[PDB]
Amino acid sequence: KFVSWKSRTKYTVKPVKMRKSGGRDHTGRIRVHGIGGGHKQNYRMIDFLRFRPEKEKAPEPFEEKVVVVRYDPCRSADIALVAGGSRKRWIIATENMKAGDTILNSNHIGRMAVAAQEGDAHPLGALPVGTLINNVESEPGRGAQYIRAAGTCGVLLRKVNGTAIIQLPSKRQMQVLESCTATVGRVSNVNHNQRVIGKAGRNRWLGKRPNSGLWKIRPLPPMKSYV
Amino acid sequence: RARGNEYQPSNIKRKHKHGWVRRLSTPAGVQVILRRMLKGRKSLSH
Amino acid sequence: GADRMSKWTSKRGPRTFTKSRGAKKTGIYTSDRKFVQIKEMVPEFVVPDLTGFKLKPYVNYRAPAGIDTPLTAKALFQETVAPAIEKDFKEGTFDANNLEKYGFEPTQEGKLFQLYPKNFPR
Amino acid sequence: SPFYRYGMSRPGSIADKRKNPPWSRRRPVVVEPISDEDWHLFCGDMVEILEGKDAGKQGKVVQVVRQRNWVVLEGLNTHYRYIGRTKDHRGTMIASEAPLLHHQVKLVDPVDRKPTEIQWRFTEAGERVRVSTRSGRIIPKPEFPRADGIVPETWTDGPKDTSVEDALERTYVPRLKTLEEDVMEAMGIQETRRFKKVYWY
Amino acid sequence: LTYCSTRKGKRKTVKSVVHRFLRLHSGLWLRRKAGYKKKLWKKSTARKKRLREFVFCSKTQSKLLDKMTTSFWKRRNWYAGDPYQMYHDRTNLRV
Amino acid sequence: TVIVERWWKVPLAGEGRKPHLHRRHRVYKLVEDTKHRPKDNLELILTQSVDEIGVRGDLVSVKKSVGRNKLLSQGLAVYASPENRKLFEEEKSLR
Amino acid sequence: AWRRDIFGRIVWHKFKQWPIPWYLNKRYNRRRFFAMPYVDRFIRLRIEKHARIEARKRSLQKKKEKILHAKF
Amino acid sequence: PLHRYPVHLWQKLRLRQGICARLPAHFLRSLEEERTPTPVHYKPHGTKFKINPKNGQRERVEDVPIPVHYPPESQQGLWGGEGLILGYRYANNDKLSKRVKKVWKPQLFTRELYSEILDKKFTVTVTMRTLDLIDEAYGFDFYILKTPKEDLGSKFGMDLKRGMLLRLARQDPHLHPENPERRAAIYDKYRSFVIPEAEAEWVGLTLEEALEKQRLLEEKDPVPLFKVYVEELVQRLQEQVL
RNA sequence: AAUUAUAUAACUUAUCUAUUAUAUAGUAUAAGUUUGAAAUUUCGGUUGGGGUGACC
RNA sequence: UCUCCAGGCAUACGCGUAUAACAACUCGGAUAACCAUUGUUAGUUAAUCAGAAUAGGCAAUAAUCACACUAUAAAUUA
RNA sequence: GAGCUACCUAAAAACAAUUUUAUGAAUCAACUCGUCUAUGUGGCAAAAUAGUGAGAAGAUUUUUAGGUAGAGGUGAAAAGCCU
RNA sequence: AACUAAUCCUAGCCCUAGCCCUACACAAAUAUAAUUAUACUAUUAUAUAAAUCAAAACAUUUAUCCUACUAAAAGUAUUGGAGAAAGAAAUUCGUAAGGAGCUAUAGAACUAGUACCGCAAGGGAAAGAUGAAAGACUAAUUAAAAGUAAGAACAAGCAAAG
Ligand SMILES: [Mg+2]
Ligand SMILES: [Mg+2]
Ligand SMILES: [Mg+2]
Ligand SMILES: [Mg+2]
Ligand SMILES: [Mg+2]
Ligand SMILES: [Mg+2]
Ligand SMILES: [Mg+2]
Ligand SMILES: [Mg+2]
Ligand SMILES: [Mg+2]
Ligand SMILES: [Mg+2]
Ligand SMILES: [Mg+2]
Ligand SMILES: [Mg+2]
Ligand SMILES: [Mg+2]
Ligand SMILES: [Mg+2]
Ligand SMILES: [Mg+2]
Ligand SMILES: [Mg+2]
Ligand SMILES: [Mg+2]
Ligand SMILES: [Mg+2]
Ligand SMILES: [Mg+2]
Ligand SMILES: [Mg+2]
Ligand SMILES: [Mg+2]
Ligand SMILES: [Mg+2]
């Protein structure tokens, strides 16, 4: 009887009501422990493909206007409503984004380096080595999947030929084509790691059930009389 | 606490748990009815 | 402790449970919950004029009862259809194609009262 | 019900519903089955008592309980009882008849009064008639008053009773039209609309 | 022992007797001596001679073996050139 | 395919009967797996001229994978049945 | 029509009036006029149950006539 | 009590009463006959006699086929008689070790095969054995037509046989249209398998499919008794006039 | 503890495809090996009773 | 009429005639009176209480007297 | 078999007065719980009564419908709970 | 000098023989929370039987269970921790309505799959007795069980025996 709530085909900026799982799967059995209850929430459909040209428009760099930078219950970072042309779409907000700012979304692969302004989306080839980036996509057109948390910025270590190396926040180096689009700057809510829960009830407000109260080298034969 | 009152009646719950439509939903439930028909039960299901 | 043997009716169960007692529907429920009764769906009692009717509920005990001969298709056919076909055959004005002339109906479609599937109540 | 015992009192009477309540489980009575054809005793037939208290005395049948092979004769095989007994009053002494089985009686030849055994045989017209085994002779079926008390000859119809001739009037005219169509045409109802397609299934 | 078989309703022979003992028609049973093929290097010459012999069974042992085998193993067998032809009967036996 | 053998003997059933099997007769061992057998070649008569095999009408032996995947599917070769052999043999004689 | 129900019996089915054809009705297609093989055992048990009743019924009538013939 | 007939005879008695009796005689023969499939998963005994090594005497030998489980997925492809062997093994191949459940599975491939008689290419789930059988039969069409139902062991395969047989039986001009010569060659090549039109129709039908076909053939709405009596009256009147 | 263990994981050889100059890829399966989620079974004897020892 | 006690009336869920009158005085109420028992006859009334056309396009801005006021757990067919 | 109970999902409810403040704060009802003693021990009760107590705007309590099932489920681990 | 009680005979049942079946019965309702006159949401068995138990434990194994004609070949050949046990074939033979059964604690559980118990799957009773006639007023028969009553007891004791 479990029908997923993620059944909306068409993009909208209206917040969408979420049904909670409880750590259980479509079978009805717990698959992850420690999830339950909490505050009711609404899902605002984020758009991680920064360079999405508007319908019936050409594929070239465009600009959008930041309406508001808002708190999002469903993620560590904060979201910014951005409007351009006749389209409104939620997006992740960088560290310094404010209302009324203008942010560029560029398709052009700069043959030379392009000056980097935080919040604008540029292909990795355009950016210069060393620039802090966020919302990186693995393959051109996929959409952003890495560096999407609060205050998490990766570095662009190297660009050679058609590919570049990205240092993910975990210090794990990844390689992607220079065509991939990465947003510049940090991801905002840099102090999220400084937040203090304080009381056990606060985690029960975020849907975190308490931990359960339940409290390997086989010797080789030649080394069993010394164990 | 005092036990013995584990039955909290509800017609919606009863017909959903042990009703005609529920029994026919799975083949094992159909065989529940087949046994009771063979035995001669006056009540096949709730 | 529920009663498994008594009949399930609308008096039992919560308010949400409702079901009919066997009365035929006379209308339709539109959206926004408006009942619209249909005049044609409501039965009409066709009552004859009984003025000057000689038949009353009971019969004379002196009246002889008759031997039972339940009606058969052959008896109906002979009483009604045989006289025409027999006379027509002698006249020679007979063919298989014109069976409608004697009262045959190839199909029941289009008739107000269809003999099969029956479309009228008693 | 397999346990209902048939008695002299008519089935369904107050006495019968007390003699045969739903919970009674009395021992079955053994009855030699007799074919409807074989049985030859009828109400109003004079019979003779072969054996018993009144053996050799001829009487008239007045009742038959076929399930018990019983023939009851008026004024014979009589014991005595009080009818209408009340707390204040004794009642009235009367003689009550008791059932006699078929094999304890025989039918009587009309012209010569004797217990003649009879055999069933047809006639020229084809109607089945009883014939005496010896002194072959037609024993006519007697006439008995109707059980409900209705004598047709004396009957005079009151209100709500159809007269004879009216009941026997023939008005049916055979035609290939149902009762529905006939009434509408006679009463002049007109309907030109036709039912839409219905998918029977 | 199987006294009544499911298929045939009879007793069954214990095929461990049939593979170890010979029954003479008179009623006697022959056997070997346990260990006659074992560790012969450390056995005395007299001991080995005793082991090689065919030996008879006691009254109770014979009674047991008769219970464990069926009648077919107790019939008289007319084998041409049998080397036990003369041992199937008793002679000069008063007892 | 996989060929299996029963571990336990099955008693004979007779001319017109089927043997009754028991739970112990469901235990098997693997005699052979035909996958690992040496693989024979396939013989086809060409209907065209294809490089590195020969001219139309010749008889060749080729790996089964090659024969089915390319020659037979593409129509280059036809099955070397006795009927096909006669037809192509006649053509060569006339040629 | 004559149809077999999900319990393995043969029952006469009386048709109903609908405004749409049968292949388009979704309430009609939930009704099943077939029995799955797990009903086969129950089919045999009914026949054997009925055979027992009839055999008992014949036996009793024979016994009853013996009582009649002894009595008469 | 007892049933009159042994339970194993019940299926034969069912075919012999009711609408099943009215089914074609030739079709019933296919239903009645039982033939063992050609051995696939066991080696058959070459001879009917063998010399026992232990006692050195001649003893009879018989072939007992392995029980093979045919998943319903197989009926939608062409497995060459192969199936699943559901059995047990002895760990380490000694009968004094534990008995372990074992399942041997066929290696299944997806292949595309062309039928000349149908002039269509089908994509089928197939085993290497099935491909070998076709090669031995010198054509995909020959494989289906030659192989019997028991060896074929596929409802999809049997339906192919009916189409091929029906195609040949009617000499349908729907094959390679506009090319009577090309068509003629194909029909001539497979002339050995031609059978009468009536028989070919009932090839590969299951008992339920056959019964529905028979019910459809004899389905007829009743005759209005008006006509029936009219026929009788006319015949009587005409006969009297004679 | 003994006996197993197509639970997962891995490799190896075949089988089947792709390619390639022999070759590196994959793999509706079979046969091995490694790992062990599990499964099945058991708890010799004599010694005011319990450590160890011992003994048969 | 007096003396004294202090969860009552509705609805939901559930129950299924225990409802009311009469007649009975066996069974049932842990005893009587009387009936909750037995038999017979009756009953609960609703357009407001309560239950039961199609296809597209689109949504940033809580609640709390909603103003001020901040906040955090970020929150309702048109 | 989850109408009890454990946990969960969805839709709904309840919290006076007083003091603090801006609260898993305080006093104390309704409500939830069950500390200590007595009565009871075939009892009113197969776990209650009478007192005395703990919490009482919260990890609170309650209602309705749904989910997870025995080689398993649930578990703020008592090997608790699953009529 | 009698209360409680007792007596009873047929309701049916049992095992065979024989036999394929063609019982599947008005109108209406019903797979919707079955038995609710019409659309909405469409509909679908199962991969190998396991274990107990026997082997005086248990670990391969353990008749029937898991059926293919009778009598013989034969408990033979064979198979097996060669133990417990298991066990063929070739071949031969073969033409056919009854009761030293039960009679109400028995015989079917059965007067009924009911009452009743259980949320459910499921479990599952007890009992009747006049006569030809009750349109003869529903009878009789029996120092007869334990239990009582008629009729409490009267120094002292396995309660009796001499
Ligand atoms: Mg811990
Ligand atoms: Mg209970
Ligand atoms: Mg509750
Ligand atoms: Mg034989
Ligand atoms: Mg009252
Ligand atoms: Mg009163
Ligand atoms: Mg009353
Ligand atoms: Mg309303
Ligand atoms: Mg619940
Ligand atoms: Mg308050
Ligand atoms: Mg507090
Ligand atoms: Mg307190
Ligand atoms: Mg406190
Ligand atoms: Mg808890
Ligand atoms: Mg602990
Ligand atoms: Mg319990
Ligand atoms: Mg044992
Ligand atoms: Mg075992
Ligand atoms: Mg009994
Ligand atoms: Mg009983
Ligand atoms: Mg006494
Ligand atoms: Mg004394």
* Residue F82 Cα to chain centre, angstroms: 16
- Distance from C-alpha of D71 to C-alpha of D30, rounded to nearest angstrom: 16
Is some CB atom of chain H closer than 8 A to the CB atom of F38? Answer: no
Answer for A208: CB within 7 Å of strand K: no
CA of D18 to C1' of J27 (A): 21
Contact in structure between A48 and A143 (CB atoms under 8 Å)? yes
| Cα G60 to the center of its chain, rounded Å | 25
What are the φ/ψ torsions at residue A140 (nearest 5 degrees)? -55, 120
Closest Cα in chain G, distance from residue B10 (Å): 27
Q: Do C48 and D183 touch (CB under 8 A)?
A: yes
Evaluate whether H79 touches H106 at the Cβ level (below 8 Å).
yes
List of residues 6+ apart from C39 with CB closer than 8 A: none
Q: Which residue is nearest to nucleotide L134 (CA to C1')?
A: D19
β-pair type (F28-33, F2-6):
antiparallel
From the CA of H38 to the C1' of I32: give the distance in Å: 31
Unique residue bearing structure tokens 């004379």: C60
Token pair for residue E67?
């219970």
Quote the tokens at residue F19.
Answer: 């043997």
Instruction: Enumerate residues 6+ apart whose C-beta is below 8 A from F84.
Output: F45, F78, H138
**Where do the H-state alpha helices sit in chain H?**
10-15, 19-22, 25-32, 128-137, 140-146, 149-152, 155-170, 180-189, 197-201, 207-218, 225-241
Tokens 């040209």 map to which residue? Answer: A53
Would you say A124 and A147 are in contact if contact means Cβ atoms under 8 Å apart? Answer: no
Q: Could you give the C-alpha distances from D84 to D9, D75, D78, D81, D99, in angstroms and in order?
A: 16, 20, 18, 10, 22
From residue C95, alpha-carbon distances to A67, C88, C90, C100, H240 in Å are: 91, 10, 12, 11, 18
Q: How far is the CA of A72 from the C1' of J63 (A)?
A: 18
Asked if D30's CB is within 8 angstroms of G67's CB, the reply is yes
Nearest residue on chain G to B36, alpha-carbon basis:
G42
Sequence-ordered strand ranges (E) for chain A: 16-17, 42-43, 62-70, 79-84, 87-92, 102-105, 121-123, 132-136, 154-160, 163-167, 173-177, 181-184
Task: Tell me whether chains A and H touch (3+ CB pairs under 8 A).
Answer: no
Kindly report the bases of strand K lying within 7 A of a protein C-beta atom.
1-4, 7-11, 24, 45-48, 58-60, 64-69, 73-78, 83
Closest residue to C56, CB basis, from D152, D153, D160: D160
Within chain H, what is the greatest distance between any pair of CA atoms?
98
- Whether A77 contacts A93, CB under 8 Å: yes
The separation, in Å, between residue A195 CA and nucleotide J70 C1' comes to 20
- Going by C-alpha positions, the residue among H83, E1, E26 that lies closest to residue F2 is H83
**F4/H88 CB distance under 8 A:** no
Alpha carbon of residue D126 to chain centroid: 23
CA–C1' nearest nucleotide, residue F14: L89
For tokens 């009604």, the residue is C80
To which H or E segment does residue D58 belong?
strand D58-65
How many CB pairs below 8 Å do chains B and C form together?
17
Whether CB of A18 is under 7 Å from strand K: the answer is: yes
Calculate the angstrom distance between C1' of L69 and CA of G35. 35
> Do D and G touch, counting CB pairs below 8 Å (3 needed)?
yes
Residue nearest to nucleotide J73 (CA to C1'): A205
Name all chains with 3 or more CB-CB pairs below 8 Å to chain D: C, G
Chains that touch B (3 or more CB pairs under 8 A): C, G
Instruction: Name which of A180, A153, A147, A188 is nearest A50 in CA terms.
Output: A180
Burial A150-168 (b: 16+ CB within 10 A, else e): bbbbbbbeeeeeeebbbbe
Pairwise CA distance, residues F89 & F36, whole Å: 36
Q: Is the CB of A6 under 7 A from strand K?
A: no
Interface residue C50 vs chain B (CB under 8 A): no
H runs (alpha helix) in H16-118 = 19-22, 25-32
Query: What separation in angstroms does the CA of D177 have from each of C105, C113, D193, H230?
Result: 11, 10, 19, 19
- Residue with structure tokens 């028609």? E25
Q: Is the CB of A27 under 7 A from strand K?
A: yes
The reply to whether A75 Cβ lies less than 7 angstroms from strand K is: no
Q: What is the spatial distance between Cα F57 and Cα F49, in angstroms, rounded to a whole number?
A: 9
Q: Which amino acid is at A188?
A: S
G50 touches chain H (CB under 8 A): no
Q: Is the CB of A22 under 7 A from strand J?
A: no
Encoded tokens for B13: 């719950």
- Report resolution (Å) to 1 decimal: 2.8
Provide, in whole angstroms, the distance separating residue A224's CA from nucleotide I48's C1': 40
CA distances from A21 to A2, A3, A72, A200, A212 (A): 9, 10, 19, 21, 19
Q: Within an 8 Å CB–CB cutoff, is residue C77 touching chain H?
A: yes
Distance from Cα A203 to the centre of ligand 13, integer Å: 23
Return all residues near B12 (Cβ < 8 A) that are at least 6 apart. C13, C14, C17
Looking at strand L, which nucleotides approach a protein CB closer than 7 A? 9-22, 24, 28-50, 59-69, 74-91, 97-99, 101, 104, 109, 111-115, 118-124, 128-138
Is H119 in contact with H176 (CB distance < 8 Å)? yes
Q: Which ligand is nearest to the CA of B17?
A: 9
Residues of H in contact with G55 (CB under 8 A): 1
Q: How many CA atoms, within 13 angstroms, populate the side-chain half-sphere of residue F90?
A: 5
Q: Is the CB of C35 under 7 A from strand J?
A: yes
B9, C1: Cβ pair inside 8 Å? yes
The 10 Å Cβ neighbour count of residue H117 is: 24
Residue F9 Cβ under 7 A from any strand I atom = no
User: F5: closest CA among H81, H42, H94?
Assistant: H42
Cβ neighbours of H234 in C, within 8 Å:
85, 89, 94
Distance from CA of D184 to the nearest CA of C (A): 9
CA distance D110 to D46: 9
